[PDB]
Design a protein around this ligand. Structure first.
Ligand code: D5M
Lengths: 520, 61, 61, 61
């Protein structure tokens, strides 16, 4: 009925010995996009050209972690458990209120239209292109008491060449072609979903460095050739070759059982403006050209933080493109001069297992040495996976995405979003929503032309998302106290992680999940 | 104003031909287009490109 | 000399796409031919005209 | 073949050298696709289904 609420606002976290369940609700506003029509989209810009469509529909996105975890909760989670992975989810939209706007002259009036319908469907079948997954605004806001605007749905189409235009292959997906539920106030929508078994994300830092796992005290039983000649001078000395049983201490020489990492090199820049070479953002030598990129169908796509690699700590004066950058509290606009106002994610913790972003993978003999010809070593920058390699994935972040859909392709290797998160073949479905059109008074004599005059409307209501996370406690045997993340903030005039006098809420730092320790 | 919904159940019969050589079939074959065919455009307008019949498959007398 | 007979049972999966605009499909499209294609000819010779793949249908990532 | 006898085989050419044997036996091979699909059939298959994979086989001479 019109008079009855169709759902209660509950946001909660319930913790278990084995599983924690998060639940949060938010209020949303839904405009009328593109005055009700699908629009072709395309621009051709050389290293950017793209093509696609913009839709009258909007969608709900809960892909950021902070959507379901209050800071404290996130804390609880990461200081206590080694791994976590999502198990099941369920969503419900309710208290739909459709508003109609009179828009008188000078003043715009708004009043409820009780008999109006907003339509929601979610598609399981994954027939619509998935977009919820990468790098984008629209997720519910972290702070509960913040109303948000449902994002408009638009999708990309395959672009052939450096020039944007469409081939027969390009396709059009029309949301109205799908069956969807129609609601009015007093109507509600609900759906459930079960995640697929997925590797627990590792929420620990290695307490051992891969290269040396051996017993410091003993020495291998293998021998290596130590020197072709005597002395410490490169090209002089007595001819004889000498072999020696690998002894305790010459660890760098120990034959090991594993190779540390897959790797792609990244350019490095210094946070101090002064240190960098001059590089423009446009023109023949715009930065893009010098930053590690992957050429695809004639178009440079700059590699996103790439195959997981070690990166300078957050405080460090140098930073690489490999690390993710978050706004930070103080920044006002879209652009800023000093990087002291930004937040940098860093994977120092990964260093124990795999190569550094700005440094190389290693160096290989790139030549066959000989008495008359000197040995030459080649610098290796790109290294595909090799038998016996072991690496760590990029960590997840409080404000980082949670899942991402694994491309529907013949081949994929070690799916783990590179931006961080769990790779799913069938990820939480995008739930679409749109305000049904309505018509302005219409002409008395019939005209075939499609109607174009519509009443102005917008809707609002609350959505509630609940996720059941499966986690695993630590159970370590380490004796010395671990590192844990605790605020440690100095005396503050207006406390952190809280709304302020203005009433504004902003997240102070970016937070990872690897504080606990574990050995290899 | 309101919505109407129409559902029709069509009975069809597959081909089952013994012809060896590949048939003609209707496929778009449209050239590179600035704004793809059979789809809404930037203006947001939708219009049908060609008139289409139903006789592409072959059968003998 | 003798005959051999081979039978294979293939498992296939229909498309089930939600794309609106007509797909590309492979249809002959051959021009008027003096001796039709994909068929034996006056000499009595049989030869395949083009090499044919299997990817004509579309699907998103 | 080979008047009934197995023969050693080898040539040494620098980027080709090879070694092996030639047998009096012969074998049946149905590894090309067109062996089991008439053009039309191949057409039917590819314009309608997303994927395919072989399930079982049986032969008789
Ligand atoms: N996040 C995520 N989603 C899906 N699949 C993933 C993920 N991380 C790793 N993998 C895959 C990569 C290999 O297919 C497999 C190896 O199992 P392992 O047990 O890791 O040796 O696990």
């Amino acid at each position: 009925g019109v008079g009855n609420a169709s759902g209660d606002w509950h946001c909660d976290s319930t913790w278990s010995e084995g599983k924690v369940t998060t639940t949060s609700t938010r209020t949303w506003v839904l405009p009328t996009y593109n005055n009700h029509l699908y629009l072709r989209l395309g621009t051709t810009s050389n290293s950017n050209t793209y093509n696609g469509f913009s839709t009258p529909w909007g969608y709900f996105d809960f892909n950021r972690f902070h959507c379901h975890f209050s800071p404290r909760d996130w804390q609880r989670l990461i200081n206590n458990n080694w791994g976590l992975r999502p198990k099941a989810m369920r969503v419900k939209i309710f208290n739909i209120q459709v508003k109609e706007v009179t828009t008188s002259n000078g003043e715009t009036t708004v009043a409820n239209n009780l008999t109006s319908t907003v339509q929601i469907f979610a598609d399981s079948s994954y027939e619509l292109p998935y977009v919820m997954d990468a790098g984008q605004e629209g997720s519910l806001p972290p702070f509960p008491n913040d109303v948000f605007m449902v994002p408009q749905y638009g999708y990309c189409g395959i672009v052939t060449g450096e020039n944007q235009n469409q081939t027969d292959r390009n396709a059009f997906y029309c949301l109205e072609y799908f069956p969807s539920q129609m609601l009015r106030t007093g109507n509600n929508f609900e759906m459930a979903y079960n995640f697929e078994k997925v590797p627990f994300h590792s929420m620990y830092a290695h307490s051992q460095s891969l290269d040396r796992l051996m017993n410091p005290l003993l020495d291998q039983y293998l021998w290596h050739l130590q020197s072709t000649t005597s002395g410490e001078t490169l090209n002089q000395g007595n001819a004889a070759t000498t072999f020696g049983k690998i002894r305790s201490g010459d660890f760098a020489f120990y034959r090991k059982n594993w190779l540390p990492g897959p790797c792609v090199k990244q350019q490095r820049f210094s946070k101090t403006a002064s240190q960098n070479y001059k590089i423009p953002a446009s023109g023949g030598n715009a930065l893009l050209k010098y930053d590690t990129h992957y050429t695809l169908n004639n178009r440079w796509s700059n590699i996103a933080p790439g195959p997981p690699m070690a990166t300078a700590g957050p405080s460090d004066g140098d930073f690489s493109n490999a690390q993710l950058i978050f706004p930070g509290p103080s920044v006002t606009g879209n652009t800023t001069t000093s990087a002291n106002n930004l937040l940098f994610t860093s994977e120092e913790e990964i260093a124990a297992t795999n190569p550094r972003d700005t440094d190389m993978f290693g160096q290989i003999a790139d030549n066959n040495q000989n008495a008359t010809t000197a040995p030459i070593t080649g610098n290796v920058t790109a290294m595909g996976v090799l038998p016996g390699m072991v690496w760590q994935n990029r960590d997840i972040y409080y404000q980082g995405p949670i899942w991402a859909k694994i491309p529907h392709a013949d081949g994929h290797f070690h799916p783990s979003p590179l931006i961080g998160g769990f790779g799913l073949k069938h990820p939480p479905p995008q739930i679409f929503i749109k305000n049904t059109p309505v018509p302005a008074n219409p002409a008395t004599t019939f005209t075939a032309a499609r109607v174009d005059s519509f009443i102005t409307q917008y809707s609002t209501g609350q959505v509630a998302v609940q996720i059941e996370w499966e986690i695993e406690k630590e159970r370590s045997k380490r004796w010395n106290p671990e590192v844990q993340f605790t605020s440690n903030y100095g005396n503050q005039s207006s406390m952190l992680w809280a709304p302020d006098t203005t009433g504004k809420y902003t997240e102070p730092r970016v937070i990872g999940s690897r504080y606990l320790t574990n050995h290899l």
